Amino acid sequence: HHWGYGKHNGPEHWHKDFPIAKGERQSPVDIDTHTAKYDPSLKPLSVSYDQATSLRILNNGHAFNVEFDDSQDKAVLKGGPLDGTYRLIQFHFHWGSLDGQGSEHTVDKKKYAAELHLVHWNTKYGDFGKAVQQPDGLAVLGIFLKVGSAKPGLQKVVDVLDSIKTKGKSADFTNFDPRGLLPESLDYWTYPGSLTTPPLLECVTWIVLKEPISVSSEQVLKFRKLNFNGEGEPEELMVDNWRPAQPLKNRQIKASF
Ligand SMILES: Nc1cc(Cl)c(S(N)(=O)=O)cc1S(N)(=O)=O
Ligand SMILES: [Zn+2]
């Protein structure tokens, strides 16, 4: 009875195996644009993905991860609310069964069709495993996806999904440039949170971009063709793999604009 997004193993059940699910800094959260405060102390956000080197893509049973070689100082996120440098390790998405839902963070309660998460770990902790055990171990750059014009830079990801339809399947995925998934503006909201999937560790500094990227209906439809189940098992379409907004509690969301 592994965790998932179904009625019997979904978000409302996670607290049993992962008590921190009801913690003080859980993610995602609803971003109230009028309550968020502009913070002039925020330094410019720096996204340096020029030397990013992807290794492959994997269907982990709940979504898919595009993994990067993080053994060297490449693909770094810094500046903004961050102290030091965070290295890119992987990115994945959360999406819905319908265009009207799919994102984890919401803006004034608005749900986007999907949400992209570029995960980075604080280099002062040596690696990802040690980083997640620290309050400032990770920095996740979140980007909303809305349905409209196609996103050319996402097509290579979309076309490879056919080869990893079921849980456990992976495929070589090199030379993918994550810069093609970024919107024009780097304006963002930031707050201290957690992983949105079990183990739900509260080790994340969230940086959510205000500007969404547009992807075509055809592109997101292919995301929905993936399977939660493994090869040869009853088909369970991989959709609605998003956790709903959690209590903000004692936290303030800061705006870079
Ligand atoms: N490993 C991992 C790390 C982070 Cl930080 C996040 S998220 N959703 O908090 O960005 C999700 C995952 S997972 N289990 O989906 O691969
Ligand atoms: Zn995520």
UniProtKB/Swiss-Prot annotation:
Residue positions, PTM Phosphoserine: S163, S170
Free-text cofactor note: Zinc. Can also use cobalt(II) with lower efficiency, but not copper(II), nickel(II) and manganese(II).
List of catalytic residues: H62
Function: Catalyzes the reversible hydration of carbon dioxide. Can also hydrate cyanamide to urea. Stimulates the chloride-bicarbonate exchange activity of SLC26A6. Essential for bone resorption and osteoclast differentiation. Involved in the regulation of fluid secretion into the anterior chamber of the eye. Contributes to intracellular pH regulation in the duodenal upper villous epithelium during proton-coupled peptide absorption.
Disease tied to this entry: Osteopetrosis, autosomal recessive 3: A rare genetic disease characterized by abnormally dense bone, due to defective resorption of immature bone. Osteopetrosis occurs in two forms: a severe autosomal recessive form occurring in utero, infancy, or childhood, and a benign autosomal dominant form occurring in adolescence or adulthood. Recessive osteopetrosis commonly manifests in early infancy with macrocephaly, feeding difficulties, evolving blindness and deafness, bone marrow failure, severe anemia, and hepatosplenomegaly.
Further comment: Target of drugs used in treatments against glaucoma disorder and breast cancer.
Name recorded for this polypeptide: Carbonic anhydrase 2
Native source organism of the sequence: Homo sapiens (Human)
Higher taxonomy: Eukaryota, Metazoa, Chordata, Craniata, Vertebrata
Name of the encoding gene: CA2
